[PDB]
Protein backbone atom coordinates (compact mmCIF):
# COMPACT_ATOMS: atom_id res chain seq x y z
CA UNK A 1 0.00 0.00 0.00
CA UNK A 2 1.07 3.54 -0.83
CA UNK A 3 -0.67 4.67 2.36
CA UNK A 4 -0.98 3.14 5.82
CA UNK A 5 -2.41 4.48 9.08
CA UNK A 6 -3.21 3.01 12.50
CA UNK A 7 -4.00 4.22 15.98
CA UNK A 8 -3.64 2.73 19.46
CA UNK A 9 -5.33 5.01 22.05
CA UNK A 10 -4.33 2.34 24.57
CA UNK A 11 -2.90 -1.19 24.42
CA UNK A 12 -5.37 -3.85 25.64
CA UNK A 13 -3.87 -7.30 26.28
CA UNK A 14 -5.34 -8.89 23.15
CA UNK A 15 -2.98 -7.52 20.47
CA UNK A 16 -2.65 -8.95 16.96
CA UNK A 17 -0.55 -6.49 14.98
CA UNK A 18 2.39 -5.95 17.29
CA UNK A 19 5.58 -7.98 17.07
CA UNK A 20 6.97 -8.25 20.61
CA UNK A 21 10.73 -8.76 20.95
CA UNK A 22 12.80 -9.34 24.09
CA UNK A 23 10.91 -8.66 27.32
CA UNK A 24 8.23 -6.43 25.78
CA UNK A 25 4.67 -7.29 26.75
CA UNK A 26 1.31 -5.75 27.58
CA UNK A 27 0.45 -4.89 31.17
CA UNK A 28 -2.20 -2.49 32.50
CA UNK A 29 -3.40 -1.51 29.01
CA UNK A 30 0.07 -0.31 28.03
CA UNK A 31 3.18 -1.77 26.46
CA UNK A 32 5.89 -2.44 29.04
CA UNK A 33 8.97 -2.47 26.80
CA UNK A 34 11.21 -3.43 29.70
CA UNK A 35 10.46 -6.08 32.32
CA UNK A 36 8.46 -5.24 35.46
CA UNK A 37 7.60 -7.43 38.43
CA UNK A 38 4.29 -8.48 39.97
CA UNK A 39 4.07 -5.09 41.68
CA UNK A 40 4.62 -3.12 38.49
CA UNK A 41 8.15 -2.16 39.49
CA UNK A 42 11.06 -2.12 37.02
CA UNK A 43 13.87 -4.68 37.18
CA UNK A 44 17.48 -4.51 36.02
CA UNK A 45 19.05 -6.05 32.91
CA UNK A 46 16.09 -6.03 30.52
CA UNK A 47 15.56 -5.12 26.86
CA UNK A 48 12.36 -5.10 24.84
CA UNK A 49 10.94 -3.78 21.58
CA UNK A 50 7.78 -3.75 19.50
CA UNK A 51 7.25 -3.35 15.77
CA UNK A 52 3.98 -2.88 13.92
CA UNK A 53 3.35 -6.02 11.85
CA UNK A 54 2.59 -4.35 8.51
CA UNK A 55 5.58 -3.08 6.58
CA UNK A 56 5.67 0.58 5.56
CA UNK A 57 6.61 1.64 2.03
CA UNK A 58 8.94 4.51 2.95
CA UNK A 59 10.11 5.32 -0.59
CA UNK A 60 9.97 4.00 -4.14
CA UNK A 61 12.77 4.55 -6.66
CA UNK A 62 10.67 3.58 -9.69
CA UNK A 63 8.21 6.43 -9.09
CA UNK A 64 10.66 8.84 -7.46
CA UNK A 65 8.35 9.05 -4.46
CA UNK A 66 9.15 9.37 -0.75
CA UNK A 67 6.66 9.04 2.07
CA UNK A 68 5.40 11.85 4.27
CA UNK A 69 4.84 10.25 7.67
CA UNK A 70 3.98 11.09 11.26
CA UNK A 71 4.29 9.12 14.48
CA UNK A 72 2.51 10.30 17.62
CA UNK A 73 3.03 8.53 20.94
CA UNK A 74 3.18 8.90 24.69
CA UNK A 75 5.27 7.13 27.30
CA UNK A 76 6.22 7.41 30.96
CA UNK A 77 9.29 6.31 32.89
CA UNK A 78 9.09 5.28 36.55
CA UNK A 79 11.82 4.14 38.93
CA UNK A 80 12.10 3.62 42.70
CA UNK A 81 15.75 4.59 42.23
CA UNK A 82 17.15 8.10 41.77
CA UNK A 83 18.82 7.57 38.39
CA UNK A 84 16.52 5.47 36.21
CA UNK A 85 18.02 4.20 32.96
CA UNK A 86 18.56 3.79 30.15
CA UNK A 87 15.98 5.08 27.71
CA UNK A 88 13.28 4.55 25.11
CA UNK A 89 13.43 5.13 21.37
CA UNK A 90 11.08 5.30 18.41
CA UNK A 91 12.79 3.72 15.40
CA UNK A 92 12.52 2.86 11.72
CA UNK A 93 14.51 -0.11 10.39
CA UNK A 94 14.63 -2.96 7.83
CA UNK A 95 11.62 -5.31 8.21
CA UNK A 96 13.66 -8.21 9.61
CA UNK A 97 15.19 -6.18 12.44
CA UNK A 98 15.84 -8.04 15.70
CA UNK A 99 17.53 -7.14 18.99
CA UNK A 100 21.30 -7.09 18.34
CA UNK A 101 23.24 -9.41 20.65
CA UNK A 102 24.58 -7.45 23.63
CA UNK A 103 22.56 -4.31 22.88
CA UNK A 104 21.56 -3.81 26.52
CA UNK A 105 21.82 -0.75 28.73
CA UNK A 106 22.85 2.42 26.94
CA UNK A 107 22.60 0.60 23.60
CA UNK A 108 18.81 0.65 24.06
CA UNK A 109 18.28 -2.66 22.28
CA UNK A 110 18.98 -0.92 18.99
CA UNK A 111 22.76 -0.98 18.60
CA UNK A 112 25.33 -3.77 18.77
CA UNK A 113 28.37 -3.49 21.09
CA UNK A 114 23.38 -0.14 10.47
CA UNK A 115 20.25 0.93 8.57
CA UNK A 116 18.16 2.91 11.01
CA UNK A 117 16.64 6.24 11.91
CA UNK A 118 15.60 6.68 15.50
CA UNK A 119 14.67 9.22 18.11
CA UNK A 120 15.94 8.32 21.56
CA UNK A 121 14.88 9.69 24.92
CA UNK A 122 17.83 8.92 27.15
CA UNK A 123 18.24 9.30 30.89
CA UNK A 124 21.55 7.42 31.21
CA UNK A 125 24.90 8.94 32.16
CA UNK A 126 27.61 8.92 29.49
CA UNK A 127 30.69 10.77 30.76
CA UNK A 128 32.23 10.74 27.26
CA UNK A 129 29.19 12.34 25.60
CA UNK A 130 30.26 14.35 22.55
CA UNK A 131 26.93 15.79 21.39
CA UNK A 132 25.08 16.55 24.64
CA UNK A 133 25.63 17.50 28.29
CA UNK A 134 26.22 14.12 30.03
CA UNK A 135 24.97 15.57 33.32
CA UNK A 136 21.39 15.68 32.04
CA UNK A 137 19.08 13.46 29.99
CA UNK A 138 18.73 14.24 26.29
CA UNK A 139 16.62 13.51 23.24
CA UNK A 140 18.70 12.56 20.24
CA UNK A 141 18.17 11.83 16.58
CA UNK A 142 20.04 8.81 15.21
CA UNK A 143 20.91 8.25 11.55
CA UNK A 144 22.56 4.98 10.54
CA UNK A 145 25.60 4.45 12.76
CA UNK A 146 25.68 8.07 13.95
CA UNK A 147 23.89 8.31 17.30
CA UNK A 148 22.66 11.70 18.47
CA UNK A 149 23.61 13.52 15.26
CA UNK A 150 21.40 16.23 16.74
CA UNK A 151 20.23 16.52 20.36
CA UNK A 152 18.37 18.71 22.83
CA UNK A 153 18.48 18.85 26.62
CA UNK A 154 15.53 17.12 28.24
CA UNK A 155 14.22 16.60 31.78
CA UNK A 156 13.19 13.26 33.30
CA UNK A 157 9.99 13.32 35.36
CA UNK A 158 9.13 10.14 37.22
CA UNK A 159 5.69 8.80 36.33
CA UNK A 160 4.85 11.71 34.01
CA UNK A 161 3.71 11.06 30.45
CA UNK A 162 5.63 12.70 27.61
CA UNK A 163 3.59 13.28 24.47
CA UNK A 164 5.67 13.12 21.28
CA UNK A 165 5.03 13.93 17.64
CA UNK A 166 7.66 12.89 15.08
CA UNK A 167 7.09 14.09 11.52
CA UNK A 168 8.93 13.74 8.21
CA UNK A 169 8.32 15.93 5.18
CA UNK A 170 10.00 14.52 2.03
CA UNK A 171 9.85 17.93 0.31
CA UNK A 172 12.17 19.53 2.86
CA UNK A 173 13.56 16.26 4.25
CA UNK A 174 13.09 17.62 7.74
CA UNK A 175 12.62 15.08 10.51
CA UNK A 176 10.90 17.07 13.27
CA UNK A 177 10.45 16.01 16.89
CA UNK A 178 8.22 17.87 19.36
CA UNK A 179 7.67 16.47 22.85
CA UNK A 180 5.60 17.93 25.67
CA UNK A 181 4.71 17.11 29.26
CA UNK A 182 1.14 17.70 30.49
CA UNK A 183 2.06 21.15 31.83
CA UNK A 184 3.17 22.35 28.41
CA UNK A 185 6.92 22.00 28.95
CA UNK A 186 8.19 21.59 25.39
CA UNK A 187 11.28 20.10 23.74
CA UNK A 188 12.09 20.43 20.04
CA UNK A 189 14.78 18.96 17.82
CA UNK A 190 14.92 18.72 14.04
CA UNK A 191 17.34 17.42 11.42
CA UNK A 192 17.52 17.13 7.63
CA UNK A 193 17.70 13.54 6.44
CA UNK A 194 17.24 11.94 3.03
CA UNK A 195 15.66 8.65 4.09
CA UNK A 196 16.67 7.11 0.76
CA UNK A 197 20.32 7.32 1.77
CA UNK A 198 19.91 5.29 4.95
CA UNK A 199 16.89 2.99 4.73
CA UNK A 200 15.51 0.40 2.28
CA UNK A 201 12.23 1.04 0.42
CA UNK A 202 10.17 -1.04 2.85
CA UNK A 203 10.68 -0.79 6.60
CA UNK A 204 9.03 -1.54 9.94
CA UNK A 205 8.41 1.06 12.64
CA UNK A 206 8.32 0.60 16.40
CA UNK A 207 9.94 1.22 19.76
CA UNK A 208 12.87 -0.11 21.77
CA UNK A 209 14.03 0.31 25.38
CA UNK A 210 16.51 -1.17 27.82
CA UNK A 211 17.87 -1.03 31.37
CA UNK A 212 21.26 -2.24 32.57
CA UNK A 213 22.26 -2.04 36.24
CA UNK A 214 20.30 1.21 36.59
CA UNK A 215 16.63 0.72 35.71
CA UNK A 216 13.19 2.22 35.13
CA UNK A 217 9.98 1.26 33.34
CA UNK A 218 9.59 2.32 29.70
CA UNK A 219 5.83 2.34 29.39
CA UNK A 220 4.40 3.07 25.93
CA UNK A 221 0.88 4.34 26.61
CA UNK A 222 -0.45 5.23 23.15
CA UNK A 223 0.66 5.36 19.53
CA UNK A 224 -0.76 6.53 16.21
CA UNK A 225 1.02 6.50 12.87
CA UNK A 226 0.39 7.53 9.27
CA UNK A 227 2.40 7.36 6.06
CA UNK A 228 1.66 8.24 2.43
CA UNK A 229 3.92 8.10 -0.64
CA UNK A 230 4.32 11.45 -2.42
CA UNK A 231 6.14 12.44 -5.62
CA UNK A 232 9.37 14.29 -4.80
Amino acid sequence: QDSLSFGFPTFPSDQKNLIFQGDAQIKNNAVQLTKTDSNGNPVASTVGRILFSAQVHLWEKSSSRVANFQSQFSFSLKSPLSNGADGIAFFIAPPDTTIPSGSGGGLLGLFAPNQVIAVEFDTFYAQDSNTWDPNYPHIGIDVNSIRSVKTVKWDRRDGQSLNVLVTFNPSTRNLDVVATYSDGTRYEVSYEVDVRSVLPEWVRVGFSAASGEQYQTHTLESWSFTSTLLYT
Copy 2:
Protein backbone atom coordinates in the same frame (compact mmCIF):
# COMPACT_ATOMS: atom_id res chain seq x y z
CA UNK B 1 -5.27 -0.61 16.95
CA UNK B 2 -8.77 0.85 17.25
CA UNK B 3 -8.33 2.36 13.80
CA UNK B 4 -6.62 1.00 10.68
CA UNK B 5 -6.49 2.20 7.09
CA UNK B 6 -4.52 1.38 3.96
CA UNK B 7 -4.63 2.22 0.29
CA UNK B 8 -3.48 0.46 -2.87
CA UNK B 9 -3.91 2.78 -5.89
CA UNK B 10 -2.25 -0.06 -7.84
CA UNK B 11 -0.54 -3.34 -6.97
CA UNK B 12 3.19 -3.26 -7.89
CA UNK B 13 5.00 -6.62 -7.86
CA UNK B 14 6.97 -5.84 -4.70
CA UNK B 15 4.14 -6.70 -2.27
CA UNK B 16 4.95 -7.15 1.44
CA UNK B 17 1.61 -7.01 3.27
CA UNK B 18 -0.55 -9.33 1.20
CA UNK B 19 -1.20 -12.95 2.05
CA UNK B 20 -1.45 -14.73 -1.30
CA UNK B 21 -3.47 -17.95 -1.39
CA UNK B 22 -4.05 -20.37 -4.24
CA UNK B 23 -3.15 -19.03 -7.69
CA UNK B 24 -3.29 -15.34 -6.73
CA UNK B 25 -0.35 -13.26 -7.92
CA UNK B 26 0.66 -9.82 -9.17
CA UNK B 27 0.71 -9.10 -12.92
CA UNK B 28 0.43 -5.79 -14.79
CA UNK B 29 0.45 -3.90 -11.47
CA UNK B 30 -2.81 -5.57 -10.49
CA UNK B 31 -3.74 -8.65 -8.51
CA UNK B 32 -4.68 -11.53 -10.79
CA UNK B 33 -6.75 -13.58 -8.35
CA UNK B 34 -7.22 -16.39 -10.86
CA UNK B 35 -4.52 -17.92 -13.06
CA UNK B 36 -3.57 -16.51 -16.46
CA UNK B 37 -1.18 -17.97 -19.04
CA UNK B 38 1.89 -16.52 -20.78
CA UNK B 39 -0.28 -14.26 -22.94
CA UNK B 40 -2.29 -13.04 -19.98
CA UNK B 41 -5.30 -15.14 -20.96
CA UNK B 42 -7.45 -16.75 -18.26
CA UNK B 43 -7.37 -20.52 -17.75
CA UNK B 44 -9.85 -23.05 -16.38
CA UNK B 45 -9.81 -24.70 -12.95
CA UNK B 46 -8.20 -21.97 -10.85
CA UNK B 47 -8.79 -20.39 -7.44
CA UNK B 48 -6.99 -17.54 -5.68
CA UNK B 49 -7.36 -15.11 -2.80
CA UNK B 50 -5.52 -12.32 -1.02
CA UNK B 51 -5.85 -11.00 2.52
CA UNK B 52 -4.24 -7.91 4.01
CA UNK B 53 -1.66 -9.01 6.59
CA UNK B 54 -2.72 -6.70 9.41
CA UNK B 55 -5.76 -7.88 11.36
CA UNK B 56 -8.77 -5.58 11.80
CA UNK B 57 -10.44 -5.18 15.19
CA UNK B 58 -14.05 -5.42 13.97
CA UNK B 59 -15.72 -5.31 17.40
CA UNK B 60 -14.82 -5.36 21.10
CA UNK B 61 -17.10 -6.83 23.76
CA UNK B 62 -15.36 -5.26 26.76
CA UNK B 63 -15.99 -1.73 25.48
CA UNK B 64 -19.27 -2.55 23.74
CA UNK B 65 -17.88 -1.13 20.49
CA UNK B 66 -18.30 -2.15 16.84
CA UNK B 67 -16.28 -0.79 13.95
CA UNK B 68 -17.49 1.48 11.18
CA UNK B 69 -15.60 0.37 8.07
CA UNK B 70 -15.35 1.06 4.35
CA UNK B 71 -13.84 -0.95 1.52
CA UNK B 72 -13.44 0.64 -1.89
CA UNK B 73 -12.07 -1.30 -4.83
CA UNK B 74 -12.10 -1.72 -8.59
CA UNK B 75 -11.92 -4.88 -10.68
CA UNK B 76 -12.35 -5.98 -14.27
CA UNK B 77 -13.23 -9.35 -15.79
CA UNK B 78 -12.07 -10.51 -19.23
CA UNK B 79 -12.74 -13.72 -21.14
CA UNK B 80 -12.52 -15.02 -24.73
CA UNK B 81 -15.71 -16.92 -23.88
CA UNK B 82 -19.17 -15.34 -23.87
CA UNK B 83 -19.93 -16.99 -20.54
CA UNK B 84 -16.96 -16.07 -18.36
CA UNK B 85 -17.07 -17.55 -14.85
CA UNK B 86 -17.32 -17.73 -11.97
CA UNK B 87 -16.90 -14.53 -9.97
CA UNK B 88 -14.99 -12.36 -7.52
CA UNK B 89 -15.80 -11.54 -3.90
CA UNK B 90 -14.72 -9.17 -1.15
CA UNK B 91 -14.80 -10.95 2.20
CA UNK B 92 -14.24 -10.64 5.95
CA UNK B 93 -13.23 -13.77 7.87
CA UNK B 94 -11.29 -15.23 10.82
CA UNK B 95 -7.57 -14.35 10.60
CA UNK B 96 -6.40 -17.92 9.90
CA UNK B 97 -8.80 -18.41 7.00
CA UNK B 98 -7.56 -20.56 4.11
CA UNK B 99 -9.11 -21.82 0.87
CA UNK B 100 -11.57 -24.60 1.82
CA UNK B 101 -10.90 -27.95 0.18
CA UNK B 102 -13.03 -28.31 -2.96
CA UNK B 103 -14.19 -24.68 -3.06
CA UNK B 104 -13.60 -24.19 -6.78
CA UNK B 105 -15.97 -22.91 -9.44
CA UNK B 106 -19.19 -21.39 -8.14
CA UNK B 107 -17.90 -21.74 -4.57
CA UNK B 108 -15.52 -18.90 -5.41
CA UNK B 109 -12.81 -20.27 -3.12
CA UNK B 110 -14.78 -19.11 -0.09
CA UNK B 111 -17.16 -21.95 0.71
CA UNK B 112 -16.58 -25.67 1.23
CA UNK B 113 -18.85 -28.19 -0.54
CA UNK B 114 -19.41 -20.52 9.12
CA UNK B 115 -17.82 -17.22 10.17
CA UNK B 116 -17.69 -14.96 7.13
CA UNK B 117 -19.36 -11.97 5.52
CA UNK B 118 -18.89 -11.51 1.81
CA UNK B 119 -20.06 -9.51 -1.18
CA UNK B 120 -19.84 -11.59 -4.33
CA UNK B 121 -20.08 -10.58 -7.96
CA UNK B 122 -21.18 -13.72 -9.79
CA UNK B 123 -21.30 -14.12 -13.56
CA UNK B 124 -21.99 -17.86 -13.80
CA UNK B 125 -25.27 -19.76 -14.02
CA UNK B 126 -32.43 -16.04 -4.54
CA UNK B 127 -31.82 -14.37 -7.92
CA UNK B 128 -32.48 -14.51 -11.66
CA UNK B 129 -30.21 -17.34 -12.94
CA UNK B 130 -30.49 -15.87 -16.45
CA UNK B 131 -28.04 -13.09 -15.57
CA UNK B 132 -25.18 -12.32 -13.17
CA UNK B 133 -25.89 -10.93 -9.70
CA UNK B 134 -24.28 -9.31 -6.68
CA UNK B 135 -24.97 -11.16 -3.46
CA UNK B 136 -24.33 -10.60 0.22
CA UNK B 137 -23.23 -13.68 2.16
CA UNK B 138 -23.50 -14.15 5.92
CA UNK B 139 -21.83 -17.19 7.47
CA UNK B 140 -23.08 -20.28 5.65
CA UNK B 141 -26.03 -18.48 4.04
CA UNK B 142 -25.14 -17.30 0.54
CA UNK B 143 -27.08 -14.52 -1.17
CA UNK B 144 -29.14 -13.54 1.88
CA UNK B 145 -29.87 -10.59 -0.40
CA UNK B 146 -29.00 -9.97 -4.06
CA UNK B 147 -29.44 -7.56 -6.95
CA UNK B 148 -29.30 -8.09 -10.71
CA UNK B 149 -25.98 -7.07 -12.22
CA UNK B 150 -24.48 -6.78 -15.71
CA UNK B 151 -21.08 -8.20 -16.65
CA UNK B 152 -19.04 -6.04 -19.04
CA UNK B 153 -15.94 -7.64 -20.51
CA UNK B 154 -12.80 -5.63 -19.76
CA UNK B 155 -14.64 -2.79 -18.02
CA UNK B 156 -13.67 -1.68 -14.52
CA UNK B 157 -16.39 -1.86 -11.87
CA UNK B 158 -15.89 0.59 -8.99
CA UNK B 159 -17.29 -0.70 -5.69
CA UNK B 160 -17.84 0.82 -2.25
CA UNK B 161 -18.84 -1.46 0.62
CA UNK B 162 -19.64 0.27 3.89
CA UNK B 163 -20.75 -0.87 7.33
CA UNK B 164 -22.44 1.41 9.85
CA UNK B 165 -22.50 -0.05 13.40
CA UNK B 166 -25.32 2.29 14.49
CA UNK B 167 -27.74 0.90 11.91
CA UNK B 168 -25.87 -2.38 11.32
CA UNK B 169 -26.44 -1.68 7.65
CA UNK B 170 -23.94 -3.24 5.22
CA UNK B 171 -24.19 -1.16 2.05
CA UNK B 172 -22.92 -2.00 -1.41
CA UNK B 173 -22.77 0.42 -4.34
CA UNK B 174 -21.06 -0.49 -7.61
CA UNK B 175 -20.75 1.62 -10.75
CA UNK B 176 -19.30 1.40 -14.25
CA UNK B 177 -17.64 4.43 -15.85
CA UNK B 178 -20.82 5.42 -17.72
CA UNK B 179 -22.69 5.88 -14.46
CA UNK B 180 -24.57 2.57 -14.52
CA UNK B 181 -25.15 1.77 -10.86
CA UNK B 182 -26.07 -1.27 -8.76
CA UNK B 183 -26.89 -1.22 -5.07
CA UNK B 184 -27.79 -3.71 -2.36
CA UNK B 185 -27.82 -3.45 1.43
CA UNK B 186 -28.59 -5.78 4.33
CA UNK B 187 -28.78 -5.51 8.12
CA UNK B 188 -26.15 -7.59 9.86
CA UNK B 189 -24.87 -7.65 13.42
CA UNK B 190 -21.22 -8.52 12.77
CA UNK B 191 -20.92 -9.70 16.38
CA UNK B 192 -23.29 -12.58 15.60
CA UNK B 193 -21.15 -14.05 12.83
CA UNK B 194 -17.51 -12.96 13.14
CA UNK B 195 -14.84 -12.96 15.87
CA UNK B 196 -13.49 -9.69 17.32
CA UNK B 197 -10.44 -9.69 15.05
CA UNK B 198 -10.62 -10.59 11.37
CA UNK B 199 -8.74 -10.26 8.11
CA UNK B 200 -10.18 -8.71 4.95
CA UNK B 201 -9.48 -9.61 1.34
CA UNK B 202 -10.75 -10.96 -1.97
CA UNK B 203 -11.39 -14.36 -3.50
CA UNK B 204 -12.18 -15.58 -7.01
CA UNK B 205 -12.42 -18.78 -9.02
CA UNK B 206 -13.12 -20.29 -12.45
CA UNK B 207 -14.26 -23.84 -13.17
CA UNK B 208 -14.51 -25.14 -16.73
CA UNK B 209 -15.76 -21.70 -17.79
CA UNK B 210 -13.16 -19.01 -17.08
CA UNK B 211 -12.28 -15.33 -16.97
CA UNK B 212 -9.70 -13.10 -15.36
CA UNK B 213 -10.58 -11.61 -11.97
CA UNK B 214 -8.31 -8.60 -11.89
CA UNK B 215 -8.26 -6.54 -8.69
CA UNK B 216 -7.03 -3.12 -9.84
CA UNK B 217 -7.11 -1.00 -6.68
CA UNK B 218 -8.26 -1.19 -3.07
CA UNK B 219 -8.52 1.16 -0.11
CA UNK B 220 -9.86 0.26 3.33
CA UNK B 221 -10.59 2.02 6.62
CA UNK B 222 -11.98 0.85 9.95
CA UNK B 223 -12.52 2.55 13.31
CA UNK B 224 -14.08 1.13 16.48
CA UNK B 225 -17.02 3.20 17.72
CA UNK B 226 -19.21 3.34 20.82
